Amino acid sequence: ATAAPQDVPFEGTLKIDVDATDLQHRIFKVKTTMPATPGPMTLLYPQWIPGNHSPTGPIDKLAGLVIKVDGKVVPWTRDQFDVYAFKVDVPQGASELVAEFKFLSPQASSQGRVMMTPEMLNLQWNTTALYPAGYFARNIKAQASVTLPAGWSYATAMETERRVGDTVTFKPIDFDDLVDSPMFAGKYYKRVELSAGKQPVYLNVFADEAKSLDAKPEQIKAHAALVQQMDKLYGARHFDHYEFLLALTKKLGGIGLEHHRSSENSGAPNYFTEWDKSWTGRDLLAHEFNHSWNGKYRRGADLATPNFNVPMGDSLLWLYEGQTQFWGEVMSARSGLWTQEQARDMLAGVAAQYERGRPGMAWRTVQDTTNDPTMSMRRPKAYRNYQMSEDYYSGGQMMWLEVDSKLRALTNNKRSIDDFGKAFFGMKNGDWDVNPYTFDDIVSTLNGVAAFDWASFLRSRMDGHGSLIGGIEANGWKLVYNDEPNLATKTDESDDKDASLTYSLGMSLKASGDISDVLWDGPAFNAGLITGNTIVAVNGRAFSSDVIKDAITAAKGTTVPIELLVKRLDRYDTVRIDYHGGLLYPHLERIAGKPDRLSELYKAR
Amino acid sequence: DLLAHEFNHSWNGKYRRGADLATPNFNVPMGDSLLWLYEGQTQFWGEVMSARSGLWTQEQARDMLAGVAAQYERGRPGMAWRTVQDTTNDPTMSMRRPKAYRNYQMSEDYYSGGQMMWLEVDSKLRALTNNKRSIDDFGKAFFGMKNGDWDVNPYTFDDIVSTLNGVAAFDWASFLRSRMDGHGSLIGGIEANGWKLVYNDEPNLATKTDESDDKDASLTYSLGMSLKASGDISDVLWDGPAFNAGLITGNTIVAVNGRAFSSDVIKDAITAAKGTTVPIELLVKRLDRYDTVRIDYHGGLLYPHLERIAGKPDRLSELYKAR
Ligand SMILES: CC(C)C[C@H](NC(=O)[C@@H](O)[C@H](N)Cc1ccccc1)C(=O)O
Ligand SMILES: [Zn+2]
Ligand SMILES: [Zn+2]
Numbered sequence: 001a002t003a004a005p006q007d008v009p010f011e012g013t014l015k016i017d018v019d020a021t022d023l024q025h026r027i028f029k030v031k032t033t034m035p036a037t038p039g040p041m042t043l044l045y046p047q048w049i050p051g052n053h054s055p056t057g058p059i060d061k062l063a064g065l066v067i068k069v070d071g072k073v074v075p076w077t078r079d080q081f082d083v084y085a086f087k088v089d090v091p092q093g094a095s096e097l098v099a100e101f102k103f104l105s106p107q108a109s110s111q112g113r114v115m116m117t118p119e120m121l122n123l124q125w126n127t128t129a130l131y132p133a134g135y136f137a138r139n140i141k142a143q144a145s146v147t148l149p150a151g152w153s154y155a156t157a158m159e160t161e162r163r164v165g166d167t168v169t170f171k172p173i174d175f176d177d178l179v180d181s182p183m184f185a186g187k188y189y190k191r192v193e194l195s196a197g198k199q200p201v202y203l204n205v206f207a208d209e210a211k212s213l214d215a216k217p218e219q220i221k222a223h224a225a226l227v228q229q230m231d232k233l234y235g236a237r238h239f240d241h242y243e244f245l246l247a248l249t250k251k252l253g254g255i256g257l258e259h260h261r262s263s264e265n266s267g268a269p270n271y272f273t274e275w276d277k278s279w280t281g282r283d284l285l286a287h288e289f290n291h292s293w294n295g296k297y298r299r300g301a302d303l304a305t306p307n308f309n310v311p312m313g314d315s316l317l318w319l320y321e322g323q324t325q326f327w328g329e330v331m332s333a334r335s336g337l338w339t340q341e342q343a344r345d346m347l348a349g350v351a352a353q354y355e356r357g358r359p360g361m362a363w364r365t366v367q368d369t370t371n372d373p374t375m376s377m378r379r380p381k382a383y384r385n386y387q388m389s390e391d392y393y394s395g396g397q398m399m400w401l402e403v404d405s406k407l408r409a410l411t412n413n414k415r416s417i418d419d420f421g422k423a424f425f426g427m428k429n430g431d432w433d434v435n436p437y438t439f440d441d442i443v444s445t446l447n448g449v450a451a452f453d454w455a456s457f458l459r460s461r462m463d464g465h466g467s468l469i470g471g472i473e474a475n476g477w478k479l480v481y482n483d484e485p486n487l488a489t490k491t492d493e494s495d496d497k498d499a500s501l502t503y504s505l506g507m508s509l510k511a512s513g514d515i516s517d518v519l520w521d522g523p524a525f526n527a528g529l530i531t532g533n534t535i536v537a538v539n540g541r542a543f544s545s546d547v548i549k550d551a552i553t554a555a556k557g558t559t560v561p562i563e564l565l566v567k568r569l570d571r572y573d574t575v576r577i578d579y580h581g582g583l584l585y586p587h588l589e590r591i592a593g594k595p596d597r598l599s600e601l602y603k604a605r
Numbered sequence: 606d607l608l609a610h611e612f613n614h615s616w617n618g619k620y621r622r623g624a625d626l627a628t629p630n631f632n633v634p635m636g637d638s639l640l641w642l643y644e645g646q647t648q649f650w651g652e653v654m655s656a657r658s659g660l661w662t663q664e665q666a667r668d669m670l671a672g673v674a675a676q677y678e679r680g681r682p683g684m685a686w687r688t689v690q691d692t693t694n695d696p697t698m699s700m701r702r703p704k705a706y707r708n709y710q711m712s713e714d715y716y717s718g719g720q721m722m723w724l725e726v727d728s729k730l731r732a733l734t735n736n737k738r739s740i741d742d743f744g745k746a747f748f749g750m751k752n753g754d755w756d757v758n759p760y761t762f763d764d765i766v767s768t769l770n771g772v773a774a775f776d777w778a779s780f781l782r783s784r785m786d787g788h789g790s791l792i793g794g795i796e797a798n799g800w801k802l803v804y805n806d807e808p809n810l811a812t813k814t815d816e817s818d819d820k821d822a823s824l825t826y827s828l829g830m831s832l833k834a835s836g837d838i839s840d841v842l843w844d845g846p847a848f849n850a851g852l853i854t855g856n857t858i859v860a861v862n863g864r865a866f867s868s869d870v871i872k873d874a875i876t877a878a879k880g881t882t883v884p885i886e887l888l889v890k891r892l893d894r895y896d897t898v899r900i901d902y903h904g905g906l907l908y909p910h911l912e913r914i915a916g917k918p919d920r921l922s923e924l925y926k927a928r
Contacts, residue, residue, distance in 0.1 A: 536859075542893040565888075565895055572860040572888055 046308035054373035113253025120186030155204035236429035258291030287328030322396015352586030402471030610651030645719015675909035725794030879905030
């Protein structure tokens with residue numbers, strides 16, 4: 001019901017002034033000022049947010065909305081068929097419209113991710129913005145300011161005009177870049193140089209406590225190496241400068257969100273201080289950084305929408321996210337954020353997920369999972385393994401691994417997926433506007449690296465129900481299962497003594513015995529068990545992770561079922577599970593006769 | 606009954622005291638042999654006087670007495686080997702430290718077992734005298750001398766006998782010894798004074814009040830155990846059904862016929878098992894292990910009450926009546 005945005009000039013400047021001082025209530029106070037055009041005027045609250053691929057704009061957290069034209073309140077009417085659109089009537093001869101409101105950010109995780117704490121805050125300008133309908137967002141010149149808690153430091157890719165006391169005024173910027181230029185602020189801050197030169201890269205760290213900022217030299221070097229390895233892959237940087245934003249916290253809501261010249265990232269307080277325990281999540285900065293090339297600069301044409309209030313088409317997210325998931329893990333190994341053994345066991349877990357952990361592939365394609373952002377909005381799902389769940393990430397990753405192996409085979413290892421990366425994202429160094437692409441562009445660039453029917457290859461994997469893990473064998477390794485723990489599973493389990501048993505009993509458990517996941521058609525599923533039931537005892541003994549694992553091993557090769565005493569709501573029963581395969585965890589093993597292209601792929605350049 | 610109990614001791618215990626208990630200083634041992642008078646008859650008068658004074662209703666006092674009677678009819682299997690007299694040694698033996706089986710080791714039964722004997726003494730005094738004398742006459746004769754005197758006036762066993770004989774001639778020495786040195790019934794005073802101990806599924810008023818608010822489950826006369834609302838067993842009756850399933854205090858009843866434990870859940874299952882041949886299935890936690898036991902108990906919920914014997918004179922109500 002809101003008129004379509006037009007690629008026409010916007011006269012004047014959209015001023016967005018935010019007071020971010022009410023940490024106790026977690027309220028962002030907002031004033032938006034813009035020229036007022038006589039007649040009906042519709043203002044938009046951003047709905048579809050770039051990088052979320054879904055209508056995540058928190059419309060019901062916009063409160064206290066009062067709109068004044070030249071100082072006189074004008075009543076507003078919401079469009080009942082577009083609840084993000086507010087309509088007012090501007091009198092003839094008017095000059096200026098001011099909208100004031102408050103963004104009531106989450107006071108608990110049940111409302112969304114927390115954005116204010118006693119020590120830090122995360123300002124996402126889309127949550128504090130109203131903008132006129134009828135214009136391509138990039139045509140609206142904007143200028144933002146923020147009043148910070150007293151004395152706090154801040155970081156953002158957006159250039160500062162002046163700080164007066166605790167009020168930071170930024171230089172004017174196009175409105176789409178404003179939304180794409182989030183800010184972290186906090187009292188415990190460290191700025192770390194990752195790459196000097198004409199297109200510099202910095203790491204901005206905020207923490208709950210100052211002791212978490214003590215990054216050691218080798219740990220900083222791994223982040224600096226990430227930047228160096230991206231240069232080798234792409235040969236260009238799509239920014240004039242880049243600002244990593246990293247929150248080390250137990251209070252701010254978790255985040256990984258890419259932008260052209262920055263990314264919003266969260267880690268635990270021990271990101272640096274316990275480097276060897278916090279490794280499984282360290283592909284995060286590599287992942288989001290890669291999006292500066294793959295997602296921000298190059299974007300699918302159906303995803304690159306003209307404003308924030310028309311729907312996004314996610315059809316090509318298996319490139320956007322899929323190949324970024326691939327490069328995040330590859331680049332973690334190439335830079336030293338991960339060890340080679342860590343990256344290899346992680347890849348083994350991905351391969352196992354599609355060989356045995358995704359029975360839903362029998363009926364649903366990876367391509368259809370590009371609709372999961374809008375279908376589910378990351379709300380809880382009963383069977384991620386059977387409904388599927390954004391597999392354009394990891395399923396896409398496996399496809400790109402096979403693409404790499406095929407490029408090598410076609411060219412006697414003279415070309416690889418690195419050549420696609422440079423060809424598709426390496427043009428136009430320094431540009432950070434949007435360069436759209438279609439499916440045919442992907443095929444054409446791949447064909448330019450090595451001639452082959454890439455259109456049929458891509459569609460057969462993304463529209464099919466068959467194996468996605470062919471890149472493992474083609475690049476010289478084989479997926480196996482044994483009772484040796486997977487490094488990723490072990491690290492993810494060991495803090496609370498949880499039990500991941502996907503490939504043995506077909507479920508995962510918390511240390512409490514509560515079932516946290518059940519594999520469709522697996523042994524636990526076939527006993528009627530669901531997530532939320534509790535394993536009370538194993539063969540009569542009070543549950544623990546060691547107890548149930550010992551029982552699985554004890555049942556290997558026998559005919560005596562494992563007796564699980566189960567609590568289902570307010571009832572207790574004993575189920576007999578005839579599982580005798582023992583503990584099974586995925587790993588990769590070399591195929592001795594074939595060249596090891598996998599290790600070449602994961603090797604630093 | 607607390608203030609009635611301790612007040613009665615001003616007469617029975619402080620003023621009149623057994624000679625072996627009335628020691629010359631605080632640092633030579635006390636002889637407790639006569640505590641079934643000191644505490645036993647005071648336990649008796651504490652409850653009687655609660656009814657006479659209105660601290661308790663008559664219905665409350667009657668259900669309390671029913672619980673005492675049931676305790677010695679069915680709740681004290683230890684009487685098969687231990688006498689009430691020997692429990693006067695429990696203060697020094699145990700110092701009220703925790704014991705596994707109050708019902709089998711016995712536990713200061715000179716209180717409530719003594720109370721039951723004194724009820725029977727009352728009934729016998731009435732029977733010997735065509736209801737012209739009662740235990741009230743022993744109270745006045747034994748403790749009613751020397752108004753205003755609060756020095757200690759010691760007594761021996763023979764003094765108890767002679768004063769009882771003065772109320773109504775009878776071989777009181779053999780009577781007292783037969784009850785305090787015996788292993789047989791102590792509840793004869795109930796029927797002699799016109800009532801009968803019965804059990805049914807109607808809650809005992811004392812048990813109900815003691816159960817309430819915390820949602821506990823006293824099941825002594827059905828499953829032979831008591832439980833907290835959590836399912837933790839708080840008591841087990843020797844040779845009862847729970848005992849015969851190997852259960853001990855501290856074990857936990859996790860489920861009843863598969864349903865998560867509650868006091869209502871286990872009570873409903875007991876009622877559902879009344880008159881059938883389907884055992885009650887209890888899921889039990891014993892330390893860190895779980896097992897299911899089958900209890901073949903089909904008597905239903907059983908709580909003690911007193912009921913009139915219609916043909917007999919109601920002396921019990923006279924005893925509990927305000928004077
Ligand atoms: C902490 C990490 C798990 C974060 C990780 N982030 C990403 O993949 C980003 O590149 C995504 N662009 C973040 C995203 C995608 C879809 C809907 C909402 C948010 C994610 O999976 O959300
Ligand atoms: Zn991503
Ligand atoms: Zn007393």
